[PDB]
């Protein structure tokens, strides 16, 4: 079957529209994809969005004992027939943990999962998971217990998943406010999804977002 359905790998970002420039053949002041900024000189576009920060923190941290037993068994039973606390798991590429004040890292409640292939533990002092690739990523998962595996950022991570077929769905935020960016969300055959949750527009220091939930087929 699906692995990102038997692991619950959802991906979630936030995008904002892209400032322009004078200069480049990389302006793409037409591009279909209003909101595909997702960073900028090796932070978010944007200023810290309080709101989105809350929507973030909140969803990735959140946990449903019970339902879990369910997805308990699924895995289980994925496992076997393949042979033939309780928190959520957050996965980052090297750059975008890099990319936190490391007085909020690792992240709370959450089990850190950072993939690299230039890091080491003497390295990473802080209480987290250090992968190799995607594929350990599903080998890591496969033994760990937790709720629903998370993915982050950045740009790459992505990419590498949603390439693989590795993305159940996507919690998809937009910030209405162009922003100078240099990384932006990668592409893919939207087709297999559907948006499933279609918030409202909430409104913070003056610029307006909402929150979406893309769903596979
Ligand atoms: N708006 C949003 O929601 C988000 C924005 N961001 C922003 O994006 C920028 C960073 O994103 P991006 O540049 O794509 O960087 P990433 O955070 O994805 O980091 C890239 C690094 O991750 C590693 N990596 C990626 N894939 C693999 C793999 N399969 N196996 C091993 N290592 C892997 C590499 O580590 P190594 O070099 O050690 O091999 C790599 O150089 C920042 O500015 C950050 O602020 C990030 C997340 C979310
Ligand atoms: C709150 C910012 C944020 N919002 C959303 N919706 N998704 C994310 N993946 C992040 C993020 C950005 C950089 C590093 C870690 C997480």
Same mark, same amino acid.
């Given at each position: 079957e699906n692995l990102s359905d038997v692991f619950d790998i959802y991906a979630i970002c936030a995008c904002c529209k892209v400032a322009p420039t004078?200069? %480049? *053949?990389?302006?793409? !002041?037409?591009?279909?994809? *209003?909101?595909? %900024?997702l960073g900028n000189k090796g932070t978010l576009?944007? =200023?810290?969005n309080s709101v989105d920060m809350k929507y973030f923190s909140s969803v990735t941290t959140y946990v449903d004992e019970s339902k879990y037993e369910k997805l308990k068994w699924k895995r289980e039973r994925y496992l076997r027939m393949e042979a033939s606390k309780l928190q959520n798991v957050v996965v980052m590429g090297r750059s975008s943990w890099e990319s936190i004040? =490391?007085?909020?890292?690792?992240? !709370?409640?959450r089990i850190n999962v950072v993939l690299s292939k230039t890091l080491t533990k003497e390295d990473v002092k802080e209480k987290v998971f250090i992968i190799d690739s995607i594929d350990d990523l599903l080998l890591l998962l496969k033994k760990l217990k937790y709720y629903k595996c998370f993915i982050i950022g950045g740009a790459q991570v992505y990419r590498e998943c949603l390439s693989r077929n590795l993305i159940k769905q996507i919690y998809f935020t937009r910030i209405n406010g162009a922003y100078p960016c240099d990384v932006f969300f990668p592409e893919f055959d939207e087709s297999e999804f559907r948006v499933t949750s279609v918030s409202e527009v909430y409104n913070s220091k003056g610029t307006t977002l909402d929150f979406l939930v893309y769903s596979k087929v």
């Open positions: 004078s200069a %480049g *053949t990389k302006n793409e !002041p037409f591009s279909p994809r *209003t909101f595909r %900024g576009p944007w =200023k810290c004040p =490391k007085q909020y890292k690792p992240l !709370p409640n």
